[PDB]
Design a protein around this nucleic acid. Structure first.
Ligand SMILES: [Mg+2]
Ligand SMILES: [Zn+2]
Ligand SMILES: [Zn+2]
Ligand SMILES: [Zn+2]
Ligand SMILES: [Zn+2]
Lengths: 45, 1161, 57, 51, 66, 169, 51
RNA sequence: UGGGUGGUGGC
């Protein structure tokens, strides 16, 4: 469900806790999570 | 031409530091390793031989089945990550660092297995040698800075260091004693042995220790009547007389030993000390009886008869003594004439025709970098490979199988060895853990950029710490331009740790054989035509430790050879070095000599260049074109004859003036400038060398300092050992890198007191601090002793506000073939021992989504293992630290080396520079932010300028750091005229030019402006000195060292509270605290401390046998001293649990402490 | 290092987390302000409180 | 939504340094005594930006 | 890195005067004279622009992260 | 002295076993227990013990007896001391020496100088300091969090109820 | 880069992002006729401190 | 909530 951002081709792909974790375009195996649905806050000082 | 000015030397430095960059010393010698060393370590001992020859319960089948493997060529490539999938692809240092990898290449090797039939198994991956960054044999030597941003490598990176199990490790240039030099040390007095002539042997190829012949003069000062000497040998057990081992090496009569040794039949004093040595060695008269004699002490075996006893003695005198000279025979003249130089020398020093030699005269040492270290450890595990193949061969020849060799290399051997031995650096086979030179390789430090720039250069010294001696810790005066007279840490390291200077280069290791050809190329005469009575005045010539011949005139030869290094027939880093005093002349080619460059002064009255520098301005225009007028870099300077290299041995035989205005003898009484000496001793000098620039004597963390030449030198050392703790910009790719420490300083300014040298550490393009406003004036007692004042509104504007990064880690383990781990969100039911934080911030997949505010004490990485065979899972979460807050950045998720999952998380927050945060001058005037004032409450000068940092008047007058004032003044001027003033030291920049310019741009001459109270405006009676200055931020804060503790974690072993900050331990109310409690005497406080806030513990004693054996059941309330049948004479006590531990330990050693509770007598 | 190197005091509560001193007590402990650490043991009884307050003050 | 080369509180800091017009400001009350729980259009100037 | 907004010492907003400063530098001005033209007369708003060294170009040298 | 030190007691027939608090098992990685070296050494002693009693119950070639007995003596020697002169040390399964009982007592960080004469304790605190002349001579500044963490037991008496109830509140 | 800010009303006491103004000169008695200030001086008080 | 080694830094 999570947009696991690809490390190479920027593809937003979710994985079902079962997929071997790579780029679908070049085999690049590095993903990262993307930012939340929440809104971040800061006090700007 | 004209005057070579200062900036012409900065042209010279731009050419040098555009050729090499910085870390030549790693890269070029590691290239030497990968190009030649493994090829020759393999082809050192290329063949093994088995044989199962005859009487195999045979039919007399006498068959030399000789099993012969010959090792061949190595195969070299890029690193390769074979997946758990099995696919192989080009690994890259980003993909290395993200994935805990080992940037390691295939090292292949073919094997020539042959069979003797004299009757009477392909490219195996034999190991993974890890590849350094930025090498020739890394894939990032080449390839296009554009694509390096496409490949995540910063151009202002430089590499030099290795990658192991992910993280970055480095090689300290370890510092060994020099080999094969003919030393004399004198021995301490409570002993019968006074003078010593010592050596340490090591083979020319290979650079490996074999022998250590020692000489001990029997005789204290008028004690030890027979003033004769014995030898000590390798593989003996006892001292052996000198003339006997001479007759053992093959020179029997007295006349030829005195002909070999003695050079003056009129030196009757030394000849007089000679005579008892022969008169004592009379009882062993010829060769083989001395061979038999040394057979009796030195491991020639008992009952092994004369011919094989003497064989073995011929082996310790064939191999195993003087091995580095040669290991073939026939040159007993070479061996004995070496030892005759030794006897010559030790008798020179025992009559004190000389000083003793000294330990630290820095030409008499060498250095070991990655080249020689990989040579040694590769040699070791390569021998281990040898015997592993040998082991498998003697199993698959008994059953006689055609072995394919590819199940005969379990290549976890050398990969596992090198991986551990750079992992912790406990240097050796792990089953040689102790007795090993510990701490070779280190965590590379990435706290700021200059810190790494020094730390990649650092050398360390193995005296150990046994011996508090201040002779090896002295700044001994060979150090001119080779190490750093400023930088060395505070404390235990001091005097040892030597940072290679900003003109250091590491000499590689070179074929000595053509140098030999250069020697015999001019009629050097051989050693067998040598009679010192025929030639007393010939010059005896060394090549790295072998005397090879004699010659009459060294001067024409050193002209020719020195000009051939000025041309390039030699390696231009080989130190051809002359002496005239000894009638000797050495050529080192040795590995690990610390050399340095100098401007070649035309030392020769042949033309008008004499006295002048050979460097012309035409060469300067050539360097400013980038080419010669039909590539022209620093290499062509080296091979032009304008700059020659010297190491510490040629530093003996030179003559330097410091700056090129001192070469011509100059033209007064001005009270601004500095006073060079006259040098009116030699009316007609022959200067041979002049310094390129004096601020090139510094270390890398030393050239940063504005005007080091106006301070008290412990503050120079302090500033150099604080410059490494700056907060700043460490490498420009902190977006993709995941490291456990990283900190970005927000607003980094190049200092207005820049140098000319900070171009070559890039610090003006990556600085690590700011210019804030200095105002040295006691204001309200808050800067009394080294605290300071900081204006809070300036922080609110962003002053030094600090980014904070941290990378965590976790991975999956495998507890069975069908039993693995799983990072999931654990329940409150199925899982054991939930952490006492919450779990809410976790996601569906166990790793928290970024953007989410995080506190300490709550999870990020919940590693749940089901317990191998409800309530069957283990909660083994990896939490965020108990001190931190933050908002999360870039949550990596991938697959490990193992094939399972892998995680890394890079949390971040931002720390406000607040009260207690340490700061630092650039002259050590350090301290903490004492107090924060808002904007209006500052003092403020006539225009509205307020200050931000107020160091103390009382911080100055004893610390005597007048350079700090000079920096503040030069800062204010270069601010107003708007440019960065050259504060590189040792110029004619006085204080007078700065004074006149500040006045003539409309100000006071000596800095002051009439500043005010902020609470009245009633003018401050004295005028206040006031300006900008460059500041930095040291790595400590107060939020990392505050800690207090009520109770909590106690150890199982001793029940005394635990040690360390990280587990919230407790403090050590140590010995001398108890001492001062005794001095005050209020011991009731002491009975609070060592009973009640600690391991308060309650035991019982039977009152008859006095022991604590009494078994304690309490809800049934019964007791029995079972050695006594005692049931009534029972007391309890109140003792420390460690005291009880003492009692149980002692009774388990059979001593019986018995505690009777009454005085007896 | 001498019998003043532990001395009793009284408690003043301040924000901005560092230890405050008088500067006349800088001489006996031999402390400067380039980052020293000074500890703070606490009595846990009445007895030791009076012990400190009458001798080690 | 942020995806920049700069981190977040960094940009909030730099935005805090930005000069606004406040000529009319005394008929705007203080934040900590304005009669709303968290922000409304009595006491805010809500900037939404997405370049 | 990139230009701050105010001065650190005083508090005159300067951040706008970065691009104008580079454009004045392009014609061959001298840096003090360029600060002279921009009306920067206390040295507080002279060190807040004079020292400053530029990294965010290097951060945009990373060909796209996404 | 007879009832205390009778010199046939300086020869051990029966070497005691301490209870396992003195050698308690350590969680290697939270499922497996690496043992303390006393447990490894008492296991080695009991193995050489049984290999002693194996020889006098069968055919024994008379120095097989001698070596197993001398090995028993060796194991009892390294139980109390692994620092004996002249002989190589007793060695572990990493390449490290064994923690004896003698190594638990001598040295700077033994039980006495490291745990009994001086030790670590609680109700401490620790920070970095700052000067502040706006103070008396007997006053020391306390950061608030350190005041929160540490405490002091004041007795509930009849003259301090109200404030202490407030400090609850 | 999609950002949403609020703007609320603070003074310089909370933080100096609410600085109204920049830099304030201040002087009285430029010829020291009260001798409230005392010059430090090498040689002579009148020459070296500019007007 | 590990041990146990080892490295660097603070006074
Ligand atoms: Mg100090
Ligand atoms: Zn992709
Ligand atoms: Zn009893
Ligand atoms: Zn409102
Ligand atoms: Zn300004």
């Amino acid at each position: 469900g999570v947009k696991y951002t690809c490390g190479a081709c920027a593809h937003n792909f979710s994985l079902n806790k079962s997929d071997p974790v790579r780029c679908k375009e070049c085999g690049h195996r590095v993903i990262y999570k993307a930012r939340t649905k929440r809104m971040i806050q800061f006090d700007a000082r | 031409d004209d005057t070579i000015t200062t900036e012409d030397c900065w042209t010279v430095i731009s050419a040098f530091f555009e050729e090499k960059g910085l870390v030549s010393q790693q890269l070029d010698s590691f290239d030497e390793f990968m190009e030649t060393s493994i090829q020759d370590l393999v082809w050192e001992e290329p063949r093994l031989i088995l044989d199962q020859p005859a009487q195999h319960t045979n039919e007399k089948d006498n068959i030399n089945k000789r099993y012969e493997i010959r090792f061949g060529k190595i195969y070299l490539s890029r690193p390769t990550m074979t997946e758990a999938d099995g696919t192989t692809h080009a690994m890259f240092p980003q993909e290395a660092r993200l994935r805990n990898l080992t940037y390691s290449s295939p090292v292949y090797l073919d094997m020539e297995k042959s069979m003797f039939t004299s009757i009477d198994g392909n490219k195996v991956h034999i190991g993974k040698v890890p590849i350094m960054l930025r090498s020739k044999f890394c894939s990032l030597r080449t390839l296009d800075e554009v694509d390096l941003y496409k490949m995540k490598e910063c151009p202002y990176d430089m590499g030099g260091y290795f990658v192991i199990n992910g993280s970055e490790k480095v090689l300290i240039a370890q510092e060994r004693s020099a080999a094969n030099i003919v030393q004399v040390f004198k021995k301490a007095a409570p002993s019968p042995i006074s003078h010593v002539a010592e050596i340490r042997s090591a083979l020319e190829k290979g650079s490996r220790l074999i022998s250590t012949m020692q000489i001990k003069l029997y005789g204290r000062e008028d004690k030890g009547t027979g003033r004769t000497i014995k030898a000590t040998l390798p593989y003996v057990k006892q001292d052996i007389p000198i003339v006997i081992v001479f007759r053992a090496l093959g020179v029997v009569p007295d006349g030829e030993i005195l002909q070999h040794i003695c050079y003056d039949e009129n030196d009757w004093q030394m000849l007089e000390m000679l005579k008892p040595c022969i008169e004592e060695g009379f009882v062993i008269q010829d060769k083989e009886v001395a061979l038999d004699f040394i057979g009796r002490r030195g491991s020639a075996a008992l009952g092994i008869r004369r011919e094989k006893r003497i064989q073995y003695a011929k082996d310790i005198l064939q191999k195993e003594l003087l091995p580095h000279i040669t290991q073939e025979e026939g040159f007993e003249t070479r061996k004995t004439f070496f030892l005759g130089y030794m006897v010559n020398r030790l008798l020179l020093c025992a009559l004190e025709r000389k000083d003793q030699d000294d330990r630290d005269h820095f030409g008499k040492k060498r250095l070991d970098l990655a080249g020689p270290l990989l040579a040694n450890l590769f040699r070791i595990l390569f021998r281990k490979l040898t015997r592993e193949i040998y082991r498998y061969m003697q199993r698959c020849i008994e059953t006689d199988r055609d072995f394919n060799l590819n199940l005969a290399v379990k290549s976890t051997t050398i990969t596992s060895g090198l991986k551990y031995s750079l992992a912790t650096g406990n240097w050796g086979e792990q089953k040689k853990a102790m007795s090993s030179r510990a701490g070779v390789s280190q965590v590379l430090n990435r706290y700021t950029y200059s810190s790494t720039l020094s730390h990649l250069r650092r050398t360390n010294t193995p005296i150990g710490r046994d011996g508090k001696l201040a002779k090896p810790r002295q700044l001994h005066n060979t150090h001119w331009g080779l190490v750093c007279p400023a930088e060395t840490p505070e404390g235990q390291a001091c005097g040892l740790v030597k940072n290679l200077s900003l003109l250091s280069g590491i000499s590689i290791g070179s074929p000595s054989e053509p140098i030999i050809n250069f020697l015999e190329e001019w009629g050097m005469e051989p050693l067998e035509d040598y009679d010192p009575a025929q030639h007393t005045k010939s010059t005896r010539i060394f090549v790295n430790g072998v005397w090879t011949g004699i010659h009459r005139d060294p001067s024409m030869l050193v002209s020719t050879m020195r000009d051939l290094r000025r041309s390039g027939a030699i390696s231009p880093e080989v130190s051809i070095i002359r002496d005239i005093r000894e009638r000797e002349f050495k050529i080192f080619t040795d590995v690990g000599r610390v050399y340095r460059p100098l401007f070649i002064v035309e030392d020769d009255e042949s033309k008008d260049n004499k006295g002048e520098l050979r460097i012309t301005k035409e060469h300067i225009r050539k360097i400013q074109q980038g080419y010669d007028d039909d590539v022209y870099g620093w290499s062509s300077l080296v091979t032009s004859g304008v700059i020659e290299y010297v190491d510490g041995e040629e530093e003996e035989t030179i003559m330097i003036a410091m700056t090129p205005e001192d070469l011509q003898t100059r033209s007064l009484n001005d009270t601004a400038k500095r006073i060079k000496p006259e040098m009116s001793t030699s009316s007609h000098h022959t200067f041979t060398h002049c310094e390129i620039h004096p601020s090139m004597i510094l270390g890398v963390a030393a050239s940063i300092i504005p005007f080091p030449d106006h301070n008290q030198s412990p503050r120079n050392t302090y500033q150099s050992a604080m410059g490494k703790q700056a907060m700043g910009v460490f490498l420009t790719n902190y977006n993709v890198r995941m490291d456990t420490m990283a900190n970005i300083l927000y607003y980094p300014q190049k200092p207005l007191a820049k140098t000319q040298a900070m171009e070559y550490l890039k610090f003006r393009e990556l600085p690590a601090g700011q210019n804030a406003i200095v105002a040295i004036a006691c204001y309200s007692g808050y800067n009394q002793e080294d605290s300071m004042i900081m204006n809070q509104s300036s922080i609110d504007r962003g002053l030094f506000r600090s980014l904070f990064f941290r990378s965590y880690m976790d991975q999956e383990k495998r507890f069975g073939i069908s039993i693995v781990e799983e990072f999931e969100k654990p329940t409150r039911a199925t899982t054991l021992r939930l952490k006492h934080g919450t779990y809410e911030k976790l996601d569906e997949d166990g790793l928290i989504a970024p953007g989410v505010r995080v506190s300490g004490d709550d999870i990020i990485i919940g590693k749940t293992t089901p317990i191998p065979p409800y309530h069957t899972k283990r909660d083994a979460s990896t939490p965020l630290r108990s001190t931190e807050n933050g908002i999360v950045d870039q949550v990596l998720l991938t697959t490990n080396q193992e094939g399972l999952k892998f995680v890394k998380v890079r949390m971040r927050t931002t720390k406000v520079p607040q009260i207690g945060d340490k700061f630092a001058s650039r002259h050590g005037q350090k301290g903490t932010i004492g107090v924060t004032y808002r904007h209006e409450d500052m003092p403020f000068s006539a225009e509205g300028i307020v200050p931000d940092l107020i160091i103390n008047p009382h911080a100055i007058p004893s610390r005597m750091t007048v350079a700090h004032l000079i920096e503040c003044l030069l800062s204010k001027v270069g601010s107003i005229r708007g440019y960065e003033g050259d504060a590189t030291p040792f110029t004619d920049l006085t204080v007078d030019a700065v004074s006149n310019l500040l006045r003539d741009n409309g100000y006071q001459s000596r800095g002051f402006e009439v500043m005010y109270n902020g609470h009245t405006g009633k003018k401050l009676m004295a005028q206040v000195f006031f300006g900008p200055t460059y500041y930095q931020r040291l790595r400590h804060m107060v939020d990392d060292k505050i800690h207090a503790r009520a109770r909590g974690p106690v150890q199982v072993l001793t029940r005394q509270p635990v040690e360390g900050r990280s587990r919230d331990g407790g403090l050590r109310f140590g010995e001398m605290e108890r001492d001062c409690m005794i001095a005050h005497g209020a011991a009731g406080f002491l009975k609070e401390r060592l009973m009640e806030a600690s391991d308060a513990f309650r035991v019982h004693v039977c009152g008859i046998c006095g022991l604590m054996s009494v078994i304690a059941n309490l809800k049934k309330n019964q007791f029995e001293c079972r050695s006594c049948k005692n049931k009534t004479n029972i007391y309890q006590l109140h003792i420390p649990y460690a005291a009880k531990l003492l009692f149980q330990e002692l009774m388990a050693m059979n001593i019986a402490p018995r505690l009777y509770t009454e005085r007896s007598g | 290092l001498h019998k003043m190197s532990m001395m009793a005091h009284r408690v003043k509560v301040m924000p901005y987390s560092t230890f405050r001193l008088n500067l006349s007590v800088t001489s006996p402990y031999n402390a400067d302000f380039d980052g020293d650490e000074m500890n703070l043991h606490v009595p846990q009884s009445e007895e030791t409180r009076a012990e400190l307050s009458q001798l080690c003050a | 939504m942020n995806t920049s080369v700069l981190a977040d509180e960094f940009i909030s800091h730099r935005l805090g340094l930005i000069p606004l017009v406040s000529e009319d400001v005394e008929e705007m009350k203080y934040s900590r005594d304005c009669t709303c729980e968290d922000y409304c259009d009595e006491c805010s100037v809500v900037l939404e930006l997405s370049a | 890195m990139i230009i701050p907004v105010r001065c650190f010492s005083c508090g005159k907003v300067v951040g706008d005067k970065w691009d104008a400063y580079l454009r004045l530098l392009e014609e061959g001005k001298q840096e003090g004279d360029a600060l002279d033209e921009l009306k920067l007369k206390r040295y507080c708003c002279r060190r807040m622009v004079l020292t400053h060294v530029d990294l965010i170009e290097k951060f945009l040298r990373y060909n796209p992260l996404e | 002295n007879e009832d205390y030190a009778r010199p046939e007691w300086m020869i051990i027939t029966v070497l005691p076993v301490p209870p396992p608090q003195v050698r308690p098992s350590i969680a290697m990685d939270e499922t497996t227990q690496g043992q303390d070296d006393l447990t490894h050494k008492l296991s080695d002693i009991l193995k050489a013990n049984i290999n002693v009693q194996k020889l006098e119950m069968d055919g024994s070639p008379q120095h097989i007896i001698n070596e197993v007995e001398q090995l028993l003596q060796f194991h009892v020697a390294t139980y109390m001391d692994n620092d004996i002169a002249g002989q190589p040390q007793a060695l572990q399964k990493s390449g490290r020496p064994v923690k004896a009982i003698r190594a638990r007592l001598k040295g700077k960080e033994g039980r006495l100088r490291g745990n009994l004469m001086g030790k670590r304790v609680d109700f401490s605190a620790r920070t970095v300091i700052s000067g502040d002349p706006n103070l008396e001579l007997d006053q020391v500044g306390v950061p608030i969090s350190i005041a929160k963490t540490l405490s002091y037991p004041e007795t509930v008496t009849q003259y301090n109820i109200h404030r202490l109830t407030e400090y609850v509140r | 880069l999609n950002i949403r800010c609020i703007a609320k009303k603070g003074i310089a006491k909370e933080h100096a992002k609410w600085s109204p103004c920049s830099a304030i000169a201040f002087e009285y008695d430029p010829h020291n006729k009260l001798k409230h200030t005392d010059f430090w001086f090498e040689v002579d008080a009148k020459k070296e401190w500019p007007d």
